[PDB]
Structure formats: C-alpha cells, structure tokens
Design a protein around this ligand. Sequence first.
Ligand SMILES: CC(C)(COP(=O)(O)OP(=O)(O)OC[C@H]1O[C@@H](n2cnc3c(N)ncnc32)[C@H](O)[C@@H]1OP(=O)(O)O)[C@@H](O)C(=O)NCCC(=O)NCCSCC(=O)c1ccc(O)cc1
Ligand SMILES: CC(C)(COP(=O)(O)OP(=O)(O)OC[C@H]1O[C@@H](n2cnc3c(N)ncnc32)[C@H](O)[C@@H]1OP(=O)(O)O)[C@@H](O)C(=O)NCCC(=O)NCCSCC(=O)c1ccc(O)cc1
Ligand SMILES: CC(C)(COP(=O)(O)OP(=O)(O)OC[C@H]1O[C@@H](n2cnc3c(N)ncnc32)[C@H](O)[C@@H]1OP(=O)(O)O)[C@@H](O)C(=O)NCCC(=O)NCCSCC(=O)c1ccc(O)cc1
Ligand SMILES: CC(C)(COP(=O)(O)OP(=O)(O)OC[C@H]1O[C@@H](n2cnc3c(N)ncnc32)[C@H](O)[C@@H]1OP(=O)(O)O)[C@@H](O)C(=O)NCCC(=O)NCCSCC(=O)c1ccc(O)cc1
Lengths: 141, 140, 141, 140
Amino acid sequence: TGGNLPDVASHYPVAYEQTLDGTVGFVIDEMTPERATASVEVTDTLRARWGLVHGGAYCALAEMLATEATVAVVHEKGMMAVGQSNHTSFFRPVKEGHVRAEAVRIHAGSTTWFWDVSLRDDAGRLCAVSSMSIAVRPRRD
Amino acid sequence: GGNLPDVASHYPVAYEQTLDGTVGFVIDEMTPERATASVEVTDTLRARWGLVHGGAYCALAEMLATEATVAVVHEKGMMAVGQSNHTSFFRPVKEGHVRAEAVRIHAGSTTWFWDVSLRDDAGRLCAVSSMSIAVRPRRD
Amino acid sequence: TGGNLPDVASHYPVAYEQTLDGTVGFVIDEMTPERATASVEVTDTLRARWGLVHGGAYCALAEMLATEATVAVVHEKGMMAVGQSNHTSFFRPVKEGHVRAEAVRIHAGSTTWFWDVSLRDDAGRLCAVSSMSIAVRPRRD
Amino acid sequence: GGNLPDVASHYPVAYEQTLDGTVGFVIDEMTPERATASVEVTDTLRARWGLVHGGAYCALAEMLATEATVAVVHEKGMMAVGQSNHTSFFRPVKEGHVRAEAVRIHAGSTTWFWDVSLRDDAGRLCAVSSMSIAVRPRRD
Ligand SMILES: CC(C)(COP(=O)(O)OP(=O)(O)OC[C@H]1O[C@@H](n2cnc3c(N)ncnc32)[C@H](O)[C@@H]1OP(=O)(O)O)[C@@H](O)C(=O)NCCC(=O)NCCSCC(=O)c1ccc(O)cc1
Ligand SMILES: CC(C)(COP(=O)(O)OP(=O)(O)OC[C@H]1O[C@@H](n2cnc3c(N)ncnc32)[C@H](O)[C@@H]1OP(=O)(O)O)[C@@H](O)C(=O)NCCC(=O)NCCSCC(=O)c1ccc(O)cc1
Ligand SMILES: CC(C)(COP(=O)(O)OP(=O)(O)OC[C@H]1O[C@@H](n2cnc3c(N)ncnc32)[C@H](O)[C@@H]1OP(=O)(O)O)[C@@H](O)C(=O)NCCC(=O)NCCSCC(=O)c1ccc(O)cc1
Ligand SMILES: CC(C)(COP(=O)(O)OP(=O)(O)OC[C@H]1O[C@@H](n2cnc3c(N)ncnc32)[C@H](O)[C@@H]1OP(=O)(O)O)[C@@H](O)C(=O)NCCC(=O)NCCSCC(=O)c1ccc(O)cc1
C-alpha cells in the first residue's frame, strides 16, 4: 500500500500521495498488533517557519501510526478506529534528518485502544512522545 | 505570509514551504490573549479515510498557540516553542474548513497555556487542544 | 446527599464520609447538565509534605466533579459514567484557603462526555485546569 | 515516612497528616530513573461507587514522579513540582492494592518527564499517568 499503510480495503477515499501523510512523506516500517514503527525524512514540508520540525508533524505521525496500527487489527472485525485523544509532549527539537516513531500498544479495550509513541531523531534521542487513545466502534458501512 | 506575526526579518523556512503553508493555515486575528486561524479542507489536510487528519487539528493548534506567544514575547528577547499539545477529537470533519480559536488562559514566566477550539463550517466543536508553550531566553 | 453529590440512587457502596472525597472535604455547590461547581477547604489532608495543595487533590476534585456532573444526567437513563482521561495542568500553587472548581461541559457524545474544569484559589487566580473525558456506558446492574 | 526521600530536616506537613499519609501511599524503591510506590485500597481511596477514586491514581503518580525528581534535584538547590499530570484509566480497581511504577523518560534542565503505570494485585494495567515535573531554582 502507499506509505506501506495496512491494506485492509480494496479502495480508500483518498490516495496516499494526496493525503497529509503522503504529502509530508510518512512511511510505515513494521506493523504488528502490539507495536508499529514509521519514519519520515525531514524536509521543509515537515518544518515550521523557525526551521525545526513542526510540533504538528510529530502529532500527525503518532496519530497515523497509532490509528493505523489499530485499523490493521480491527478493520476485518467490522470495526472502525479513529483517534480520540492525542497528547504529545516535546522534549527536544529536530532540525533535520528523520523522525522515527515507535508505537507500543499498552491497552486494548473493547471501545478504546491506547498506544504510547516515542519519536526519536537520527542520533536516537527522544525528541517527543505521544499518548494516543484510539476509539474503536462498529463500522457504519 | 499565512499572516503569521512579522517579528523577524528572516525566517529559516518560507511560509509556502512550511507544513503550515503546505496545508494552507492562515491566521485571521491575533492579540496577546486570543488568536484565530483557519484552513480550507483539501486532500492535503485529510487522511486516506477521507476525514481531516487528527494531526491537522494538532498542527493548527500548535502553530496558532505558539505564534500567538511569539507575537508577544519575541520582541522581549524570548523564544517560544510548544512543550505539550493535548488534542481531543469529538467530531470528524469531512470537507469545508477548520476554524481554530486560541484563548490564552495562563501566561507565566516560563510557560503560557492556550485552549484551542477547532470548529467545522457549521460551528460545531470538532476538536479541542490544550497547548503548553515554553518561553525561554533566545539563544545568541 | 453527602458532599451534596447528586442523589441518583437510594444506596451507595461507600458512605460519603468514608470516601476520599469525604475525607478531604470536597463539596459540590451547583450542578446542572452543562456546568457544576465544587470547593474544598485546604487543610493538611489536602496538602503534600511541602505544604502546598497536592497535585492529586486538584485532579481528584476535577474527577469527582466532572464524573458526578455526568452521573447526575445519565444515571436515570440507565448508564454509568466513569473517568477515562484526566489531564490536569498546574499553573500556581495553593498554600491555604480553599480550592474552587468550575466544570463546564464542552462535548456530550453518546460514549464520551468532556468537561473543562478550572481550579481557582480564594483570590480568584487560576491555579490549575483539568480536561476530563468521562466514559458513558450502559449500567451492568 | 511513607519512605519519602529524606532530603530536608523539616517539612511543612508531617507525612501522617498529608494527603499521601492519609490515604497511605508508601514509596518502595527510588532511584534517579525509576521509582515505585503502593497503597492498600481502603474506603479512603475509594469514591462512593466503591471503586478506587480516579484522583487516587493521579495523586499516587504525582507524589511518586515529583518525589523521585526531588530525590535527585533537591541537593542541587532546585525545587521540583508537578506541571502537568495526564492520567488515563483502563480498568477499575475495587479492592486490594494499587502499585505504581514510575519510569523517567526525559530529564531536561527545566522539565523532567515520568511515565507512571498503575497496576492492580493481578498485575493488570489499570491506569497510566504521563507526569511533567517542573524543576526551578529553590527560593531563598
Ligand atoms: C473507561 C472504560 C469503561 C472503557 O471500557 P470499555 O472499552 O467500554 O470496556 P472493556 O470491555 O475494555 O472493559 C474493561 C473493563 O472496564 C470495566 N467496564 C467496562 N464497561 C463497564 C460497565 N458498563 N460497567 C461497569 N464496568 C465496566 C470493566 O471493569 C471491564 O472489565 P470486565 O468486567 O468486562 O472484565 C474502561 O476502560 C474503564 O472502566 N476504565 C477504568 C475507569 C476508572 O476506574 N476510572 C477512574 C475513576 S474516575 C471516577 C471517579 O474518580 C469518581 C470520584 C468521585 C465520585 O463521586 C465519582 C467518580
Ligand atoms: C510550574 C511552575 C513552577 C512554572 O512557573 P514559572 O514559569 O517558573 O514561574 P512563574 O514566575 O510564572 O511563577 C508563578 C508562580 O509559581 C510559583 N513558583 C514559580 N517558581 C517557583 C519557585 N522556584 N519556587 C517556589 N515557587 C515558584 C510561585 O507561586 C509563582 O508565583 P510568585 O510567587 O512568583 O508570585 C508554576 O506554574 C507552578 O508553580 N505551578 C503550580 C505547581 C503545583 O502546585 N503543582 C501541583 C503540586 S504537584 C506536587 C505534588 O502533588 C506532590 C505530592 C506529594 C509529594 O510528596 C510531593 C509533591
Ligand atoms: C471518537 C468518537 C467516534 C466517539 O463517538 P461516539 O461517542 O461513539 O458517538 P457519537 O454518537 O457522539 O457520534 C459523534 C460523531 O462521531 C462520528 N462517529 C461516531 N461513531 C461513528 C462510527 N461508528 N463510524 C463513523 N463515524 C462515527 C459521527 O460523525 C458522529 O456523528 P453522527 O454521524 O452520528 O451525527 C467521536 O467523538 C468522533 O468521531 N470523534 C472524532 C474522531 C476524529 O476525527 N479523530 C481525528 C482523526 S484521528 C485519525 C487520523 O488522523 C488518521 C491519520 C492517518 C491515517 O492513515 C489514519 C487515521
Ligand atoms: C521545551 C524545552 C525548550 C524545555 O527545555 P529546557 O528545560 O529549557 O532546556 P534543556 O536545557 O533541557 O534543553 C534541551 C534542548 O532544548 C532546546 N532548547 C532549550 N532551550 C532553548 C532555547 N532557549 N533556544 C533554543 N533551543 C532551546 C535545545 O535543543 C536543547 O538542547 P541543547 O541545545 O541545550 O543541547 C525543550 O524541551 C524543547 O526544546 N522541547 C522541544 C520543543 C519543540 O520542538 N516543540 C515542537 C515545535 S512546537 C512549535 C510549532 O510547531 C510551530 C509551528 C508553526 C509555527 O509557525 C510556530 C511554531
């Protein structure tokens, strides 16, 4: 699939290249029910005007990763998954290189899954973390 | 230039090349205690599922809260940067616009806090973001 | 009811005076579907060893207020309400006096209600805020 | 004295009179990067509905994260205080104990961040708390 997102359906409303994720270059590497990773090359498109990766870019990468990792498991069960809360804290800026995210599932309830995402720079330094709660609900179609 | 606060003669990244300029964030009003901004929904703002990306609301909030702090503190020798962003999502947005309004609720010496509300074209509260902005002496 | 909590049932598992809320002295003042207030006199029981109100005391007052305000509306509809996320940020310490909390409902969905709680000191200063998400689910009994 | 870090000769409030001593919080292990604490469930820890109070998990996390920062920074002339506490609740606890484990994930000059996991007697993760601790020069 585009950006290596889970392929859970034959078509999607928006093609990868046209989505925010495609635009900024997010790509999923590993994907398992309890852990997933993704990364993105830093370019100006990922930065704010001050020159460092935009705080929203870390939120977004976390959001896509944690939601899609949930989607990978729940879609075939007839459920949809969507972000309900995204709490990202920023410890160190990233000027360039990549941002690498690792999502670890820490709770999988019937209505809410929760994932902790660490976002690191190319030296391995923890630049941000995001705690994501993902709502899971039966699909409407 | 997205109408961001004109506080410096040079910025490392031009608006149009930033995440903000790429998705189309524009600031409407800005005062020390309250600031607004908006964006048209386009595919660039969406996830593959066709609804606005959760990261878009976070990003809009982050830019608005931070730049509304920059607008005040930059001329004081300070830099402003997001330290925590908590966004909660109540209703999706499929198309139209997202409109953010940031209300300053605390301005301490090292931290400012803004509540951001993100509404759809019908005025419905689709998401909120509680933004903590660190304020530190600018580096030489 | 004890602490003026909503009286939605004829009995409760734990008497007010014996609960955490009773122990520290939380009391609800106003209670409406979209807004509720409560307050507590600061005594050592509310403080940490350093002498200021414990961060947990603000979390707890917010939690009781936002959950009970939801309970007041949903109990008779056959639902239970319980805290799902409590995010409290601390802006100014409180040494003594009272802490006064005001809870404003900002979203009432079918599964989650969300309340913003402001916690102020006797001078009116905003000492903390809490964003609370309250899960609402059908009661089991 | 709940076995809190013995960093000062006098504290404004004795353990037994604090919120912590009233509900019975006790610290078990403490190192610069990791600390544990626990509490017996009693009615004092509960809401009227019979389950542990959400505020109890928050309080336990707040004390543990803060005091684990105090333990390091106090002798350096710094004070430590909670700046943000985000607790998410996954499973209730009706009785037994709550056991908290705090893991330091960032120690910056002005902010330390701890992840706290709160488990029941069966080891099940009942709640988590992401704690931000401000660190500032102690006032004279
Ligand atoms: C929030 C939620 C209900 C979402 O759960 P879900 O996805 O609908 O359901 P899920 O199948 O994962 O259930 C997980 C566990 O949650 C509990 N639960 C879920 N639904 C229900 C329900 N309808 N009724 C009772 N318990 C339920 C139950 O313990 C369940 O385990 P099991 O009995 O089914 O094995 C669940 O994750 C949960 O129970 N979290 C813990 C909530 C909690 O304990 N919050 C802290 C207390 S906040 C409240 C408070 O402090 C307060 C203070 C003063 C006061 O006056 C009033 C309140
Ligand atoms: C977090 C922070 C220190 C950031 O402040 P800042 O930007 O450096 O400084 P700012 O100049 O805006 O100061 C605002 C107010 O903060 C307080 N403050 C700031 N810095 C200091 C300091 N170095 N020393 C003492 N107070 C300070 C002070 O009240 C100040 O007002 P003023 O005296 O200057 O008029 C300030 O917003 C604050 O104090 N927030 C409240 C923190 C709080 O009360 N947290 C809840 C307690 S969490 C701890 C806890 O529960 C615990 C439990 C058990 C246990 O064993 C240990 C701890
Ligand atoms: C989280 C939740 C589903 C909880 O809702 P609830 O309490 O179950 O249901 P409630 O009756 O209040 O419904 C409120 C509205 O939510 C929506 N909704 C609720 N349930 C469903 C459902 N089963 N299917 C579709 N929409 C639903 C719907 O819009 C509803 O309005 P209506 O059509 O019924 O008038 C709802 O509050 C909500 O939809 N919040 C907004 C979620 C959101 O848009 N999150 C941000 C996007 S996060 C995802 C993301 O960024 C991503 C990025 C990349 C990628 O590859 C994948 C994902
Ligand atoms: C929040 C804080 C400044 C607190 O740091 P602190 O405790 O004062 O200082 P600490 O000594 O631990 O510094 C750690 C690192 O922070 C950075 N930093 C700290 N203070 C400064 C400063 N005054 N100037 C520049 N960098 C600083 C610096 O990278 C430092 O490393 P080093 O150069 O000292 O090796 C630091 O943790 C931090 O920088 N976190 C990352 C902040 C971040 O990158 N947030 C996301 C961007 S949010 C903004 C945004 O998206 C935006 C979008 C659009 C727009 O138009 C405007 C903004």
